[PDB]
Each structure stands twice: as structure tokens, then as C-alpha cells.
Design a protein around this ligand. Structure first.
Ligand code: XG4
Ligand code: MG
Ligand code: MG
Ligand code: MN
Ligand code: MN
Length: 539
DNA sequence: GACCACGGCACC
DNA sequence: AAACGGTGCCGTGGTC
């Protein structure tokens, strides 16, 4: 384009270069804009931010987050990435979008601004006529990007000193386990090397090899195969404990406290909006959507996430979300009655697993039951279900058969979805979000059936993500007016931060908004708790 | 230093 | 590991 003097006119498309992918940590190297056949390159990008009223262009949210970091209210506007992601959720990166819709993603702000303009015009034209996708764009994704920008810039408080001390305790427990392993193996070696561990367990020792690795065909040392040998040898027990502790230490305990931002004093993730095939968000740098919780040690890690002084965390989580969605999508009256009668299928399944009754189930049992219910639903095999549960193969067959028989209309909806998927090439959510699944007609059974599992899972998981996103859109302005903050989303859950004097009203308000986000043939129920830390707020 | 593949595993 | 789905990060082992 023709070079034009900064500032650009309103509504121009922006381009920007960051020193690193994380907006909260990045140095803004260059800033440019393009409109009306002109290009505008900023002489000093930081000062030039003040001239923009809106971040409109590729990766708009990132720039908006960096602006909020600098105290500037620069909301994100149109982003061609959001248009492409709605056209096809395999559009996940600017490189691929440009290579697909006519452009080149470079490292120069001016070119990124010019690309943003062309790509918007092209993708906008491609969506001309996709009424449902346009609705998702205007009413969910585009306003959501603003919500996520505020969440990313706000961050979450972390009890660093607590995690530092925990790192030292866990270290001593790791050393003891390592010593028991070396002594049992008769020599030292790198316990973190699965290749070296393979030799010890299966060659040196005579333990049988349950399974192989996918790509290289090596004897697997995964927990699933080692769990089979939890009695066939004692060193296996200690190795599983060693991995558990090193996993949590190396992934969470040690890195997280080193990511506190100097200006905010809090921990800042990134909520990626075009990263999944089903419409879910993802979290990275660091991923705060997979903080441990299953084990007592993992719960100790959760307690590190705390509220600012004078505030309280509010945790809200949808109940049996994808099962309620399946009720609406399929119409199985039996399944609708379950929820219109207040029954809990996770608890009910936990009863048959552990042979204990209703009131006896604790969270640990119910978690196990939750994996079973969704495992069976989305196509787990009797052989694997026999592996888990530790019941005979026939006993796993009967459970899967009774599971689907309890809700007869579910299996019928699956086939309608696949038929439509085969005919149409894609499956869609309740709101029309699409995922393309061409392999539904592949000639290799394994490939075809794998694609089938992906196909009929997407409308359920995708609808749940749609509902959550829409709830965040509706809830955010209500939180601001009450002086509350939205901190985290974990697919079917939100963590808010509210002043102590308002935490109660915020919790009630957020519960109502999430439950009424979009009435279905089944009621949506939300569980809510308040506490000083993430764990106590969710229990 | 920068990338990357792989096995492995944490979250919903 | 295996006919659950969706993610991202770890250390290892390797290349340039
Ligand atoms: N396929 C699959 N989906 C899963 C799994 N775990 C979770 N999901 C999906 C399906 C779940 O509906 C959704 C939310 O997960 P939660 O909040 O941890 N559990 P829920 O909402 O079911 O029940 P409650 O909140 O009353 O304990 O994530 C899994 O192992 N597999
Ligand atoms: Mg991988
Ligand atoms: Mg899986
Ligand atoms: Mn839930
Ligand atoms: Mn949840």
C-alpha cells in the first residue's frame, strides 16, 4: 500500500509484532495500520497505542491484552482468525489462514496490517449467507474476545511462598522413592528416561510387557500397563509414585511461582480462542485449565490459587453438563426425566462400581465414575472398560449394554448425526458451529470409526462450549457493574473474584446467569461455592 | 541457542 | 494399551 502518516483513520486494520507470544510479557516491537489503500507505520509503537480506539485485525485479543497491561482500554474488534475458525475450526493459526485464504503471514507489522484487511474482506465475503455462523461471530466470539482480554490482563493471585515450601517437601519424597527404585533395580539410572526404564523393567527384570507405543513400537511403560503389574512386582508401585510427584513438581509446583508478573503480582494465562476442533477454549503459557485436583497432593496445589486481600473466589461449575446437552440434542425422555427428577448419573454409576450406596460416595469415587460415564458414552470398548473397574470382560459388556439401554434414544441420535455428517461432510452444534469430518467415509474401518467417535462427540462438547461462551458474554458486564472479576474458565466452570462484601450476591447472580444462559428441554444446574482459595471455593 | 517427535500425563 | 472425546506441558532424545 501507499505509506501514510500516523495516526490512521478510525476503523483501520491493525498489525503488530511482539518480542514473544505472551502479550502480558511481550515487548511491543512494531505497530502498523491499514485502510483505504494506505498503510500507517507508527514511529513509536507504545505511544501509538494511545491513538487507537479498537484493536481490529489478526490476533486482536493479544494486542488488547498488552494494551490493558499498559492501562489502555483498547477493546478487540473484528479478527479474521475468528471468521476462519467459525468457517472451519482447523483454521487455528495466522500462517494457515493466510496460506488458505490468499496472503502471507510475515514478521512485519505493516504487512500484518495489510494482510488483516484483505483476509477480513475475503473471509467476510465467504460468510455472507452463513446466518448461523454470523450470529455466533457477532453474539459470542467477537464479544467473548473482549471478555478473555480482561481475564488475561487481570490474572490470578498465587501463594508463592506456599509453593516454594511445597517444592522442598515434594523433593525429599521424590528422593526417597528414587532410592527405593535404584536399590530394587540394583543400579542407578535416569528414572525420567522411559527408554532406560523399559530396559530395567522388561529386560533386566522379567516383567511382562502389556503393550507397545504407537509410533515406535517400543514396550510401553505407561501407567495403564504398569497398573497391571501393581502386584507382579514392587518396584512398579514406587515408579508410579515417583512419576506422580515429578509430574506435579516439574509441571506445576516449580514453574508456576516463577511466572508471577512484576507489575501485577499475579499469574497470567492465555485463553486461546481458535485452538480446538469442537469450539472449546484452551489455556496456555501456563495452562491453567489442567491444574491438579484428583489427588490430595494435587489439591494442595489448588490451594495456592487464592483471592486478593479483601476478596473471595467464587467457583461455578455446570452439573453433568454434556449429559444435559445430550438430553436436549437427542430428546431421550428417560434421560430428560433423570434431570427433571434431580438424579445424578455420576453418583449412580459410582454406586455400582464401588458397591457402596449414594450417601457413601466421596469425590474420589465420583470422579472415577465420571470418566466411566463419558468413556462408555463416546465409544469405549468392553476390553478397556474391563481393564478399568477390574471386572471380567463379560461384566464390562453388560454395563455398556445397560448404560445405553437406560437411555434408548441416545444411540438413535448418534446415527442421525453420522448420516448427516456423511452427507454434509460436517457435524454441527446446537447453534450451528461446524466441524468437518471427511473420514466418515474412509475405507479403513479403524480410521472410519475413529472419525465417527470424533463426529458425534463434537455436537455435545461443542454445544457445551457454546453455552459456556454465551454465559461468559452475558455475565461479564454484570460482574463489572458489581465490581467483580472473571478470572478463569475451565470448559464448564468459571472462577470469579469478588470483594468480600459482595461475594454472596455475585455468586447468586452468576449462578442464575449460567443456568438461564439458554433454556433447553432440560434444566441447567450450576454448583457454586465461595472461599479464599480455589479448592475451598469448589467444595 | 532454536527447533522437533515421542512417550507420557495433567484437566474438562 | 486397548473402539472414549477435547486440550497443553513435561523430559528425553535428537537435529541444525
Ligand atoms: N470424553 C470425556 N469428557 C469428559 C471427561 N471429563 C470431563 N469431560 C467433559 C464432560 C463433562 O460434562 C464436562 C465437564 O466436566 P466436569 O465438570 O469435571 N464434570 P461434569 O460436568 O460431567 O459433572 P459434575 O460437574 O456434576 O461433577 O467435561 C472425560 O474423562 N472424558
Ligand atoms: Mg503429542
Ligand atoms: Mg482421550
Ligand atoms: Mn461440571
Ligand atoms: Mn468442571
Amino acid at each position: 500500500l501507499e505509506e501514510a502518516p500516523w495516526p490512521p483513520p478510525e476503523g483501520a486494520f491493525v498489525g503488530f509484532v511482539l518480542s514473544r507470544k505472551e502479550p502480558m510479557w511481550a515487548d511491543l516491537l512494531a505497530l502498523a495500520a491499514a485502510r483505504g489503500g494506505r498503510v500507517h507505520r507508527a514511529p513509536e509503537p507504545y505511544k501509538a497505542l494511545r491513538d487507537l480506539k479498537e484493536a481490529r485485525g489478526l490476533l486482536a485479543k493479544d494486542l488488547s491484552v498488552l494494551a490493558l497491561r499498559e492501562g489502555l482500554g483498547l477493546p478487540p474488534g473484528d479478527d479474521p482468525m475468528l471468521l476462519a475458525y467459525l468457517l472451519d475450526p482447523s483454521n487455528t493459526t495466522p500462517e494457515g489462514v493466510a496460506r488458505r485464504y490468499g496472503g502471507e503471514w510475515t514478521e512485519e507489522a505493516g504487512e500484518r496490517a495489510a494482510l488483516s484487511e484483505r483476509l477480513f474482506a475475503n473471509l467476510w465475503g465467504r460468510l455472507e449467507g452463513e446466518e448461523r455462523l454470523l450470529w455466533l461471530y457477532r453474539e459470542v466470539e467477537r464479544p467473548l474476545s473482549a471478555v478473555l482480554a480482561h481475564m488475561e490482563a487481570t490474572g490470578v493471585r498465587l501463594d508463592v511462598a506456599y509453593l516454594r515450601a511445597l517444592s522442598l517437601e515434594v523433593a525429599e519424597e521424590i528422593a526417597r522413592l528414587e532410592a527405593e527404585v535404584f536399590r530394587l533395580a540394583g543400579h542407578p539410572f535416569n528414572l525420567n528416561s522411559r527408554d532406560q526404564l523399559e530396559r530395567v523393567l522388561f529386560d533386566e527384570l522379567g516383567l511382562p510387557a502389556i503393550g507397545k507405543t504407537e509410533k515406535t513400537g517400543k514396550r510401553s511403560t505407561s501407567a495403564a500397563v504398569l497398573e497391571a503389574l501393581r502386584e507382579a512386582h514392587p518396584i512398579v508401585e514406587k515408579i508410579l509414585q515417583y512419576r506422580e510427584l515429578t509430574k506435579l513438581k516439574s509441571t506445576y509446583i516449580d514453574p508456576l511461582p516463577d511466572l508471577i508478573h512484576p507489575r501485577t503480582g499475579r499469574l497470567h494465562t492465555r485463553f486461546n480462542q481458535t485452538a480446538t476442533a469442537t469450539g472449546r477454549l484452551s489455556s496456555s503459557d501456563p495452562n491453567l485449565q489442567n491444574i491438579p485436583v484428583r489427588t490430595p497432593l494435587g489439591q494442595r496445589i489448588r490451594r495456592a490459587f487464592i483471592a486478593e486481600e479483601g476478596w473471595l473466589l467464587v467457583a461455578l461449575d455446570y452439573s453433568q453438563i454434556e449429559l444435559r446437552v445430550l438430553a436436549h440434542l437427542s430428546g431421550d425422555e428417560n434421560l430428560i426425566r433423570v434431570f427433571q427428577e434431580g438424579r445424578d448419573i455420576h453418583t449412580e454409576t459410582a454406586s455400582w462400581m464401588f458397591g457402596v450406596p449414594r450417601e457413601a460416595v466421596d469425590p474420589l469415587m465420583r470422579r472415577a465414575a465420571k470418566t466411566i460415564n463419558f468413556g462408555v458414552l463416546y465409544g469405549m470398548s468392553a476390553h478397556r472398560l474391563s481393564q478399568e473397574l477390574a471386572i471380567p470382560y463379560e461384566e464390562a459388556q453388560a454395563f455398556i449394554e445397560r448404560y445405553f439401554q437406560s437411555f434408548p434414544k441416545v444411540r438413535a441420535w448418534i446415527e442421525k448425526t453420522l448420516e448427516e455428517g456423511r452427507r454434509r461432510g460436517y457435524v454441527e452444534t446446537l447453534f450451528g458451529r461446524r466441524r468437518y469430518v471427511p473420514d466418515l467415509e474412509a475405507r479403513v474401518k479403524s480410521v472410519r470409526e475413529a472419525a465417527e467417535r470424533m463426529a458425534f462427540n463434537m455436537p455435545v462438547q461443542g454445544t457445551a462450549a457454546d453455552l459456556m461462551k454465551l454465559a461468559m458474554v452475558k455475565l461479564f458486564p454484570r460482574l463489572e457493574e458489581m465490581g467483580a472479576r472473571m478470572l478463569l474458565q475451565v470448559h464448564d466452570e468459571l472462577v470469579l473474584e469478588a470483594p468480600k462484601e459482595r461475594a454472596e450476591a455475585v455468586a447468586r447472580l452468576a449462578k442464575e446467569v449460567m443456568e438461564g444462559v439458554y433454556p433447553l428441554a432440560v434444566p441447567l444446574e450450576v454448583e457454586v461455592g465461595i472461599g479464599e482459595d480455589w479448592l475451598s471455593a469448589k467444595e
